[PDB]
Amino acid sequence: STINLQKAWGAARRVSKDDWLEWLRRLSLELLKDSSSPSLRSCWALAQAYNPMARDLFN
Amino acid sequence: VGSDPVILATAGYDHTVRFWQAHSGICTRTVQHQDSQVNALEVTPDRSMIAAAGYQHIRMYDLNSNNPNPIISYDGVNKNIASVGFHEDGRWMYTGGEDCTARIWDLRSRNLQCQRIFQVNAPINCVCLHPNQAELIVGDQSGAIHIWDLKTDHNEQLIPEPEVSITSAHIDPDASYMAAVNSTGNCYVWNLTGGIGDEVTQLIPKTKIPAHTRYALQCRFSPDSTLLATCSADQTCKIWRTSNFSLMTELSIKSGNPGESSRGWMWGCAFSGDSQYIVTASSDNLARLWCVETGEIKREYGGHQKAVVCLAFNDSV
Amino acid sequence: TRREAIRVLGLLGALDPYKHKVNIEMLVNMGNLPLDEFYPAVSMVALMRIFRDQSLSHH
Amino acid sequence: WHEMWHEGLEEASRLYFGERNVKGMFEVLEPLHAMMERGPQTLKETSFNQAYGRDLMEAQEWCRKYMKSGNVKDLTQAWDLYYHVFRRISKQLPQLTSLELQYVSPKLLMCRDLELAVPGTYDPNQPIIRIQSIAPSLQVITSKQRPRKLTLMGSNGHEFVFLLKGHEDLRQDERVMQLFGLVNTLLANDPTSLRKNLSIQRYAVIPLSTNSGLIGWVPHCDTLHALIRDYREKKKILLNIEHRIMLRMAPDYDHLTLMQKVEVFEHAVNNTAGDDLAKLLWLKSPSSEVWFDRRTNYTRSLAVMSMVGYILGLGDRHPSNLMLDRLSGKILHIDFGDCFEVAMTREKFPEK
Amino acid sequence: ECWIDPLSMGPQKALETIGANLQKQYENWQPRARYKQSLDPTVDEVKKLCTSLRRNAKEERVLFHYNGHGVPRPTVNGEVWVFNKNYTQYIPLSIY
């Protein structure tokens, strides 16, 4: 469960703000899906729908 | 210890008094000192029994007999005894304490109570008997040196520097110069006016030596009166020549490495009979017999569990 | 318009910052708990914010 | 009653066994006998007079027999009964973690919507926040003096917590709070000080007798000693590490000379990183932006109380007597028992 | 518990008080009987208690009152929970 993560990490092909913002979204959602604690894994569907939810659970 | 011409006692927080040998570096005999530490040792001029000033008791152990209990336990004091003097005749004994009350104790008399008292304002840090056996120099924490005359009681108070605790002060056997030491780390030398019957004893300030950066702890002239050892909390025992007041040799026990904090304070300085050697106690639990001219550790004394605050040295035949 | 909005801040003067002051938990959550408790607590807190208001209707 | 009898027998034991002052011992105990001579006014007083009161009265017979006979065997019978109830009381006192109004004083429980206003709240400009109701439970603080933690409901609806100290005269504290009011006024008037937001944190003090009174409980506070204790147990650091290092290097620390003490103290300081309070202020703070604001207030508040304390003469400032606001960051000083350089004057453990 | 709030009186005193009250309560129905309380007992303590009361009345009825509100529920294997000497572990006790 660290293959899609390594794609998000070593992309670095972002030449704008929304490009990195898109990178962030992919990074956050991959961490939720991965996350061992199911209380976080359960919130993955909402985070896809709502960006603020992803940022509140980022840390 | 007693039969041996040279004496070298040692004592600290470990409640022992270890009598070493200068020629070898071997502990000949220890002596127990319970209920307190030892703040200052002192061999008697008669050399029959050593003294050990501690907390609320001036004890005096036997030098001849081995493993004895304290012969004398002068009680009736408080707040420690910083130092102890001894009259060369062997009759009178002087002390100084933090109770702001100098005293005199008659060893010959069996009376527990002392004989004379010279109360002062601030705690007494150091005693020093004048070689003429008539004047007693007395430092204090406020800075005021005094000269309590033993015949006229005319104390001539004097403050070299305001609001600095003078920690020790010594006067050479020839009564030429008198040195004092304070918590700033200066070494105020005073030229003694030549008065005995007149007892003028005027102190002429000669030189303020900037001896150390940090607290200085003891100064003492040699029997030659050519050298003035001055110990401090900077882990260096500097030796100043009496003539020029210059640093002939600096004996340091530093680590030689910036990563070493508070290795141990140096407060021991006892010259040899001929100013060839110099004894030195340190808080690193180790006595050190240094060489004066060269500056080399001749012998090292070890075996003390705790720090070593006192020294004794006696080459009196 | 921006020009006027400045010209009006000019005429009204420059207020002293003090004079204007008179005129006018997520990290704490983690600071306390262990991580196995923290994860439910932080999930709930993030869900409660969505629960209030009309944002809940969408999600 | 059992607390008064406890402190009374402690004082009477010091007079008799310590000083051998027998007449003064009776002067200590005879008010407590007249105290119970009112009778049981509450259920707690009933159960005391039931369990102990019978024995105390019997010990009074031996005391009253001694007054007209003068025998050691007469008075020792009373001290046997006195120490009997004292040991039973001494066992009880740790168990008194909380007091219920129904038992200790039901009068206060009945009290509802009193017109008498909340102590130290009355202002001639503000509307009187009269007492709505008293809470039923009293969380007794486990200390040497065993202060209470009173809490009152205001008519405005907000709770007001207080600290009910016994046998601690609070007229000094009341006067000192008047002084802080004056200084706060002066700081408000100075523009430089006002710009820096300098002020002294103060609390209500309401005396009730020569012994007892009310102190206003400051919320969001905890003693400095507690903070350091709790931080060091978290980080697995020994609470008494500095003391242990000193006694290891030199076990005679108390009897050492001044210079010796300075060495010992320095040796401890060099071998201990004294950053515990700074470090814990960081961890406690939620964010750096708040952390910085907390520290600015902290530094200024301390300086303000340093200068004011010097002038007032406030000594005996060990870390149990000052507490830190975990939100504003300001320092608070409490228990101004020692003033006008009393600590310097006293021979025992003088503070310089 | 036995009409006594245990948290009001503090832990140790409350346990003694409930045992005393329970004795009194039983003494309403049977006042002439040897009562012997066991308060959070060990296994040996239960053995010595029951064997002593059995020795006293070998041929007569002896009452065994058990209140397991503070211990985990009994197991399917016919076991009942008691404490260890240190009150750190629930020790099982076979019904047999």
Coordinates of N, CA, C and O in Angstrom, one line a residue, chain D residues 46-198:
Chain D
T46 N -24.2 15.8 65.0 CA -24.8 14.7 65.7 C -23.9 13.5 65.7 O -23.6 12.9 66.8
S47 N -23.4 13.1 64.5 CA -22.5 11.9 64.5 C -21.2 12.1 65.1 O -20.6 11.1 65.5
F48 N -20.7 13.4 65.2 CA -19.5 13.6 66.0 C -19.7 13.4 67.5 O -19.0 12.7 68.2
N49 N -20.7 14.1 68.0 CA -21.1 14.0 69.4 C -21.4 12.6 69.8 O -21.2 12.2 70.9
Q50 N -22.1 11.9 68.9 CA -22.3 10.4 69.1 C -21.0 9.7 69.3 O -20.8 9.0 70.3
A51 N -20.1 9.7 68.3 CA -18.9 8.9 68.3 C -17.9 9.4 69.3 O -17.5 8.7 70.2
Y52 N -17.5 10.7 69.1 CA -16.4 11.3 69.9 C -17.0 12.0 71.1 O -16.4 11.9 72.2
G53 N -18.0 12.8 70.9 CA -18.5 13.7 72.0 C -18.6 13.1 73.4 O -18.3 13.7 74.4
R54 N -19.0 11.8 73.4 CA -19.1 11.1 74.7 C -17.7 11.0 75.3 O -17.5 11.1 76.5
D55 N -16.7 10.6 74.5 CA -15.3 10.4 75.0 C -14.7 11.8 75.4 O -14.0 11.9 76.5
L56 N -15.0 12.8 74.6 CA -14.4 14.1 75.0 C -15.0 14.6 76.3 O -14.2 15.1 77.2
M57 N -16.3 14.5 76.5 CA -16.9 14.8 77.8 C -16.3 14.0 79.0 O -16.1 14.6 80.1
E58 N -16.0 12.7 78.7 CA -15.3 11.9 79.8 C -13.9 12.4 80.0 O -13.5 12.5 81.2
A59 N -13.2 12.8 79.0 CA -11.9 13.4 79.2 C -12.0 14.7 79.9 O -11.0 15.1 80.6
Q60 N -13.1 15.5 79.7 CA -13.3 16.7 80.4 C -13.4 16.5 81.9 O -13.0 17.3 82.7
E61 N -14.0 15.3 82.3 CA -14.2 15.0 83.7 C -12.8 14.8 84.3 O -12.6 15.3 85.5
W62 N -11.9 14.2 83.6 CA -10.5 14.0 84.2 C -9.8 15.4 84.2 O -9.0 15.7 85.1
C63 N -10.1 16.2 83.2 CA -9.5 17.6 83.2 C -10.1 18.4 84.3 O -9.3 19.1 85.0
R64 N -11.4 18.3 84.6 CA -12.0 19.0 85.7 C -11.7 18.4 87.0 O -11.7 19.1 88.0
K65 N -11.3 17.1 87.1 CA -10.8 16.5 88.3 C -9.4 17.0 88.6 O -9.0 17.3 89.7
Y66 N -8.6 17.2 87.5 CA -7.2 17.8 87.7 C -7.3 19.2 88.2 O -6.4 19.6 89.0
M67 N -8.3 20.0 87.8 CA -8.4 21.4 88.2 C -8.6 21.5 89.7 O -8.1 22.5 90.3
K68 N -9.2 20.5 90.3 CA -9.4 20.6 91.8 C -8.7 19.5 92.6 O -8.8 19.4 93.8
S69 N -7.8 18.8 91.9 CA -6.9 17.8 92.6 C -5.5 18.1 92.3 O -4.7 18.2 93.2
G70 N -5.1 18.1 91.0 CA -3.7 18.3 90.6 C -2.9 17.0 90.6 O -1.9 16.9 91.3
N71 N -3.3 16.0 89.8 CA -2.7 14.7 89.7 C -2.3 14.5 88.3 O -3.0 14.8 87.4
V72 N -1.1 13.8 88.2 CA -0.7 13.4 86.8 C -1.5 12.2 86.3 O -1.8 12.1 85.1
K73 N -1.9 11.3 87.2 CA -2.7 10.2 86.8 C -4.2 10.6 86.4 O -4.8 9.9 85.7
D74 N -4.6 11.8 86.9 CA -5.9 12.3 86.5 C -5.8 12.8 85.1 O -6.7 12.4 84.2
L75 N -4.8 13.6 84.8 CA -4.7 14.2 83.4 C -4.3 13.3 82.4 O -4.6 13.5 81.2
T76 N -3.6 12.2 82.7 CA -3.2 11.2 81.7 C -4.4 10.4 81.2 O -4.3 10.0 80.0
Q77 N -5.4 10.3 82.0 CA -6.6 9.6 81.5 C -7.3 10.5 80.4 O -7.9 9.9 79.5
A78 N -7.3 11.8 80.6 CA -7.8 12.7 79.6 C -7.0 12.6 78.3 O -7.6 12.5 77.2
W79 N -5.7 12.6 78.4 CA -4.9 12.6 77.2 C -5.0 11.2 76.5 O -4.8 11.2 75.3
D80 N -5.3 10.2 77.2 CA -5.6 8.9 76.6 C -6.9 9.0 75.7 O -6.9 8.5 74.6
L81 N -7.9 9.6 76.3 CA -9.1 9.8 75.5 C -8.9 10.8 74.4 O -9.4 10.7 73.3
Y82 N -8.1 11.9 74.7 CA -7.9 12.9 73.7 C -7.1 12.3 72.5 O -7.4 12.5 71.4
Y83 N -6.1 11.5 72.8 CA -5.3 10.9 71.7 C -6.1 9.7 71.1 O -5.8 9.4 69.9
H84 N -7.1 9.2 71.8 CA -7.9 8.2 71.2 C -8.8 8.8 70.0 O -8.8 8.3 68.9
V85 N -9.5 9.9 70.4 CA -10.3 10.5 69.3 C -9.4 11.2 68.3 O -9.8 11.3 67.1
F86 N -8.2 11.7 68.7 CA -7.3 12.3 67.8 C -6.9 11.4 66.7 O -6.8 11.7 65.5
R87 N -6.5 10.1 67.1 CA -6.1 9.1 66.1 C -7.3 8.7 65.2 O -7.1 8.6 64.0
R88 N -8.5 8.6 65.8 CA -9.6 8.3 65.0 C -9.9 9.5 64.0 O -10.3 9.2 62.8
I89 N -9.8 10.7 64.5 CA -10.0 11.9 63.6 C -8.9 11.9 62.5 O -9.2 12.1 61.4
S90 N -7.7 11.8 63.0 CA -6.6 11.8 62.0 C -6.8 10.8 60.9 O -6.3 11.0 59.8
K91 N -7.3 9.6 61.2 CA -7.7 8.6 60.2 C -8.8 9.1 59.3 O -8.8 8.9 58.1
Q92 N -9.8 9.8 59.9 CA -10.9 10.3 59.1 C -10.5 11.4 58.1 O -11.0 11.4 57.0
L93 N -9.7 12.3 58.5 CA -9.5 13.5 57.7 C -9.1 13.3 56.3 O -9.5 14.0 55.4
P94 N -8.2 12.3 56.0 CA -8.0 12.0 54.5 C -9.2 11.6 53.8 O -9.3 11.8 52.6
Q95 N -10.2 11.0 54.5 CA -11.4 10.5 53.8 C -12.4 11.6 53.5 O -13.2 11.4 52.6
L96 N -12.2 12.8 54.1 CA -13.1 13.9 53.8 C -12.6 14.6 52.5 O -12.0 15.7 52.5
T97 N -12.9 13.9 51.4 CA -12.6 14.5 50.1 C -13.6 15.5 49.6 O -13.3 16.5 48.9
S98 N -14.9 15.4 50.1 CA -16.0 16.3 49.7 C -17.0 16.3 50.8 O -17.2 15.4 51.6
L99 N -17.7 17.5 50.9 CA -18.7 17.7 51.9 C -20.0 18.1 51.2 O -20.0 18.9 50.3
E100 N -21.1 17.4 51.6 CA -22.4 17.6 51.1 C -23.2 18.6 52.0 O -23.1 18.5 53.2
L101 N -23.8 19.6 51.3 CA -24.6 20.6 52.1 C -25.6 20.0 53.0 O -25.9 20.5 54.1
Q102 N -26.3 18.9 52.5 CA -27.3 18.2 53.3 C -26.8 17.8 54.6 O -27.6 17.9 55.6
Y103 N -25.6 17.4 54.7 CA -25.0 17.0 56.0 C -24.4 18.1 56.8 O -24.7 18.4 57.9
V104 N -23.5 18.9 56.1 CA -22.7 19.9 56.8 C -23.5 21.1 57.2 O -23.4 21.5 58.4
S105 N -24.3 21.6 56.3 CA -25.1 22.8 56.7 C -26.3 22.8 55.7 O -26.2 23.4 54.6
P106 N -27.5 22.3 56.1 CA -28.6 22.2 55.2 C -29.3 23.6 55.0 O -30.0 23.8 54.0
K107 N -29.1 24.5 56.0 CA -29.5 25.9 55.8 C -29.1 26.4 54.4 O -29.9 27.0 53.7
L108 N -27.8 26.2 54.1 CA -27.3 26.8 52.8 C -28.0 26.1 51.6 O -28.2 26.7 50.6
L109 N -28.3 24.8 51.7 CA -29.0 24.1 50.7 C -30.4 24.7 50.4 O -30.8 24.9 49.3
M110 N -31.2 25.0 51.5 CA -32.5 25.7 51.3 C -32.3 27.0 50.6 O -33.2 27.4 49.8
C111 N -31.3 27.7 50.8 CA -31.1 29.1 50.3 C -31.2 29.1 48.8 O -30.5 28.4 48.0
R112 N -32.3 29.8 48.3 CA -32.5 29.9 46.9 C -32.7 31.4 46.6 O -33.4 32.1 47.3
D113 N -32.2 31.8 45.4 CA -32.4 33.2 44.9 C -32.3 34.3 46.0 O -33.2 35.1 46.2
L114 N -31.2 34.2 46.7 CA -30.9 35.2 47.7 C -30.6 36.6 47.0 O -30.0 36.7 46.0
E115 N -31.1 37.7 47.7 CA -30.8 39.0 47.3 C -29.3 39.4 47.6 O -28.7 40.2 46.8
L116 N -28.8 38.9 48.7 CA -27.4 39.1 49.0 C -26.5 38.7 47.8 O -26.6 37.6 47.3
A117 N -25.7 39.6 47.4 CA -24.9 39.5 46.2 C -23.7 38.7 46.3 O -23.2 38.4 47.5
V118 N -23.1 38.2 45.2 CA -21.9 37.4 45.2 C -20.7 38.2 45.7 O -20.5 39.3 45.3
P119 N -20.0 37.7 46.7 CA -18.9 38.5 47.3 C -17.9 39.0 46.3 O -17.5 38.3 45.4
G120 N -17.5 40.3 46.5 CA -16.5 40.9 45.7 C -16.9 41.1 44.2 O -16.1 41.4 43.4
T121 N -18.2 41.0 43.9 CA -18.7 41.3 42.6 C -19.4 42.7 42.5 O -19.5 43.3 41.4
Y122 N -19.8 43.2 43.7 CA -20.7 44.5 43.6 C -19.9 45.6 43.0 O -18.8 46.0 43.5
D123 N -20.5 46.3 42.0 CA -20.0 47.5 41.5 C -21.1 48.5 41.4 O -22.3 48.2 41.1
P124 N -20.9 49.8 41.8 CA -22.0 50.8 41.7 C -22.5 51.0 40.3 O -23.6 51.5 40.2
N125 N -21.7 50.7 39.3 CA -22.2 50.9 37.9 C -22.9 49.7 37.4 O -24.0 49.8 36.7
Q126 N -22.4 48.5 37.6 CA -22.9 47.2 37.1 C -24.2 46.8 37.8 O -24.4 47.3 39.0
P127 N -25.0 46.0 37.2 CA -26.2 45.5 37.9 C -25.8 44.4 38.9 O -25.0 43.6 38.6
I128 N -26.5 44.4 40.1 CA -26.1 43.5 41.1 C -26.3 42.0 40.7 O -27.4 41.7 40.3
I129 N -25.2 41.2 40.7 CA -25.3 39.8 40.3 C -25.6 39.0 41.6 O -24.7 38.5 42.2
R130 N -26.8 39.0 42.0 CA -27.2 38.3 43.2 C -27.1 36.8 43.1 O -27.2 36.3 42.0
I131 N -27.0 36.2 44.3 CA -26.8 34.7 44.3 C -28.1 34.0 43.8 O -29.2 34.2 44.4
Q132 N -27.9 33.2 42.8 CA -29.0 32.4 42.3 C -29.2 31.2 43.2 O -30.3 31.0 43.8
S133 N -28.2 30.3 43.3 CA -28.3 29.1 44.2 C -26.9 28.6 44.4 O -25.9 28.8 43.7
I134 N -26.7 27.9 45.6 CA -25.5 27.3 46.0 C -25.4 25.9 45.5 O -26.4 25.1 45.6
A135 N -24.3 25.5 45.0 CA -24.1 24.1 44.5 C -24.1 23.1 45.7 O -23.6 23.5 46.8
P136 N -24.6 21.9 45.5 CA -24.7 21.0 46.6 C -23.4 20.4 47.1 O -23.3 20.0 48.3
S137 N -22.5 20.2 46.2 CA -21.2 19.6 46.5 C -20.1 20.6 46.8 O -20.0 21.6 46.1
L138 N -19.2 20.3 47.7 CA -18.0 21.1 48.0 C -16.8 20.2 47.9 O -16.5 19.4 48.7
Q139 N -16.0 20.5 46.8 CA -14.8 19.7 46.5 C -13.7 20.2 47.4 O -13.0 21.2 47.2
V140 N -13.5 19.4 48.5 CA -12.5 19.8 49.5 C -11.1 19.6 49.0 O -10.8 18.5 48.6
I141 N -10.3 20.6 48.9 CA -9.0 20.5 48.4 C -8.1 19.8 49.5 O -8.1 20.2 50.7
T142 N -7.3 18.8 49.0 CA -6.5 18.0 49.9 C -5.2 18.8 50.1 O -4.2 18.6 49.3
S143 N -5.1 19.6 51.1 CA -3.9 20.3 51.5 C -3.7 20.3 53.0 O -4.4 19.6 53.7
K144 N -2.6 21.0 53.4 CA -2.4 21.0 54.9 C -3.5 21.7 55.6 O -4.0 21.2 56.7
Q145 N -4.1 22.8 55.0 CA -5.2 23.5 55.7 C -6.5 23.0 55.3 O -7.5 23.4 55.9
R146 N -6.6 22.2 54.2 CA -7.9 21.6 53.7 C -8.8 22.8 53.3 O -9.9 22.9 54.0
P147 N -8.5 23.6 52.3 CA -9.5 24.6 51.9 C -10.6 23.9 51.1 O -10.5 22.9 50.5
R148 N -11.8 24.6 51.1 CA -12.9 24.2 50.3 C -12.9 24.8 48.9 O -12.1 25.7 48.7
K149 N -13.7 24.3 48.1 CA -13.9 24.9 46.7 C -15.4 25.2 46.6 O -16.1 24.5 45.9
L150 N -15.8 26.3 47.1 CA -17.2 26.8 47.0 C -17.4 27.3 45.6 O -16.6 27.9 44.9
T151 N -18.7 27.0 45.1 CA -19.1 27.5 43.8 C -20.5 28.0 43.9 O -21.4 27.2 44.3
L152 N -20.8 29.2 43.5 CA -22.1 29.9 43.5 C -22.6 30.1 42.1 O -21.9 30.5 41.2
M153 N -23.9 30.0 42.0 CA -24.6 30.3 40.7 C -25.1 31.8 40.8 O -25.8 32.2 41.8
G154 N -24.7 32.6 39.8 CA -25.1 34.0 39.8 C -26.5 34.1 39.2 O -27.0 33.3 38.5
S155 N -27.1 35.3 39.4 CA -28.4 35.7 38.8 C -28.2 35.9 37.3 O -29.2 35.7 36.6
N156 N -27.0 36.4 36.9 CA -26.7 36.5 35.5 C -26.6 35.1 34.8 O -26.7 35.0 33.6
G157 N -26.4 34.0 35.6 CA -26.4 32.7 35.1 C -25.0 32.1 35.1 O -24.9 30.8 35.0
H158 N -23.9 32.9 35.3 CA -22.6 32.4 35.3 C -22.2 31.8 36.6 O -22.6 32.4 37.7
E159 N -21.5 30.7 36.7 CA -21.0 30.2 37.9 C -19.8 31.0 38.4 O -19.0 31.5 37.7
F160 N -19.7 31.1 39.8 CA -18.6 31.8 40.4 C -18.0 30.9 41.4 O -18.6 30.5 42.4
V161 N -16.7 30.5 41.2 CA -16.0 29.6 42.1 C -15.2 30.4 43.1 O -14.7 31.4 42.8
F162 N -15.2 29.9 44.3 CA -14.4 30.5 45.4 C -13.6 29.4 46.1 O -13.8 28.2 45.9
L163 N -12.7 29.9 47.0 CA -11.9 29.1 47.8 C -12.1 29.5 49.3 O -11.7 30.6 49.7
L164 N -12.7 28.6 50.1 CA -13.0 28.9 51.4 C -11.9 28.5 52.3 O -11.8 27.3 52.8
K165 N -11.0 29.4 52.6 CA -9.8 29.1 53.5 C -10.3 29.3 55.0 O -11.0 30.2 55.3
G166 N -9.8 28.4 55.8 CA -10.0 28.5 57.3 C -8.7 28.7 58.0 O -7.6 28.4 57.5
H167 N -8.8 29.4 59.1 CA -7.7 29.8 60.0 C -6.5 30.3 59.1 O -5.4 29.8 59.2
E168 N -6.8 31.4 58.4 CA -5.8 32.1 57.6 C -6.4 33.5 57.5 O -7.3 33.8 56.6
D169 N -5.9 34.5 58.3 CA -6.4 35.8 58.2 C -6.2 36.5 56.9 O -5.0 36.5 56.4
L170 N -7.2 37.0 56.3 CA -7.2 37.5 54.9 C -7.3 39.0 54.8 O -7.5 39.5 53.7
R171 N -7.2 39.7 55.9 CA -7.2 41.1 55.9 C -6.0 41.7 55.2 O -6.1 42.7 54.5
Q172 N -4.8 41.1 55.4 CA -3.7 41.4 54.6 C -3.9 41.3 53.1 O -3.7 42.3 52.4
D173 N -4.4 40.2 52.7 CA -4.7 40.0 51.3 C -5.7 41.0 50.7 O -5.5 41.5 49.6
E174 N -6.7 41.3 51.6 CA -7.7 42.3 51.2 C -7.0 43.7 51.0 O -7.3 44.4 50.0
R175 N -6.1 44.1 51.9 CA -5.4 45.3 51.8 C -4.5 45.3 50.6 O -4.4 46.3 49.8
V176 N -3.8 44.2 50.3 CA -2.9 44.1 49.2 C -3.6 44.2 47.9 O -3.1 44.8 46.9
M177 N -4.9 43.7 47.8 CA -5.6 43.8 46.6 C -6.0 45.3 46.3 O -6.1 45.7 45.2
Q178 N -6.2 46.1 47.4 CA -6.4 47.5 47.2 C -5.2 48.2 46.6 O -5.3 49.1 45.7
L179 N -4.0 47.7 47.0 CA -2.8 48.3 46.4 C -2.7 47.9 44.9 O -2.3 48.8 44.1
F180 N -2.9 46.7 44.6 CA -2.9 46.3 43.2 C -3.8 47.1 42.3 O -3.5 47.5 41.2
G181 N -5.0 47.4 42.8 CA -5.9 48.3 42.2 C -5.3 49.6 41.8 O -5.5 50.2 40.7
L182 N -4.6 50.2 42.8 CA -4.0 51.5 42.6 C -2.9 51.4 41.5 O -2.9 52.3 40.6
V183 N -2.1 50.4 41.5 CA -1.0 50.3 40.5 C -1.6 50.1 39.2 O -1.1 50.6 38.2
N184 N -2.6 49.2 39.0 CA -3.3 49.0 37.8 C -3.8 50.4 37.2 O -3.7 50.6 36.0
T185 N -4.4 51.2 38.1 CA -4.8 52.5 37.6 C -3.7 53.3 37.0 O -3.8 54.0 36.0
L186 N -2.5 53.3 37.7 CA -1.4 54.1 37.3 C -0.9 53.6 35.9 O -0.6 54.4 35.0
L187 N -0.9 52.3 35.7 CA -0.4 51.7 34.5 C -1.4 52.1 33.3 O -0.9 52.3 32.2
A188 N -2.7 52.1 33.6 CA -3.7 52.5 32.6 C -3.4 53.9 32.2 O -3.6 54.2 31.0
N189 N -3.0 54.8 33.1 CA -2.9 56.2 32.8 C -1.7 56.4 31.9 O -1.7 57.2 31.0
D190 N -0.6 55.8 32.2 CA 0.7 55.9 31.4 C 0.4 55.4 30.0 O 0.0 54.2 29.9
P191 N 0.7 56.2 29.0 CA 0.5 55.6 27.6 C 1.4 54.5 27.3 O 1.0 53.5 26.7
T192 N 2.7 54.7 27.5 CA 3.7 53.6 27.3 C 3.3 52.3 27.9 O 3.3 51.3 27.2
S193 N 2.9 52.3 29.2 CA 2.5 51.1 29.8 C 1.2 50.6 29.2 O 1.1 49.4 29.0
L194 N 0.3 51.5 29.0 CA -1.0 51.0 28.4 C -0.8 50.4 27.0 O -1.4 49.3 26.7
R195 N 0.1 50.9 26.2 CA 0.4 50.3 24.9 C 1.0 48.9 25.1 O 0.7 48.0 24.3
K196 N 1.8 48.7 26.1 CA 2.3 47.4 26.4 C 1.3 46.5 27.1 O 1.7 45.3 27.3
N197 N 0.2 47.0 27.5 CA -0.9 46.2 28.2 C -0.3 45.6 29.5 O -0.6 44.4 29.8
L198 N 0.3 46.4 30.3 CA 0.8 46.0 31.6 C -0.3 46.1 32.6 O -1.0 47.1 32.7

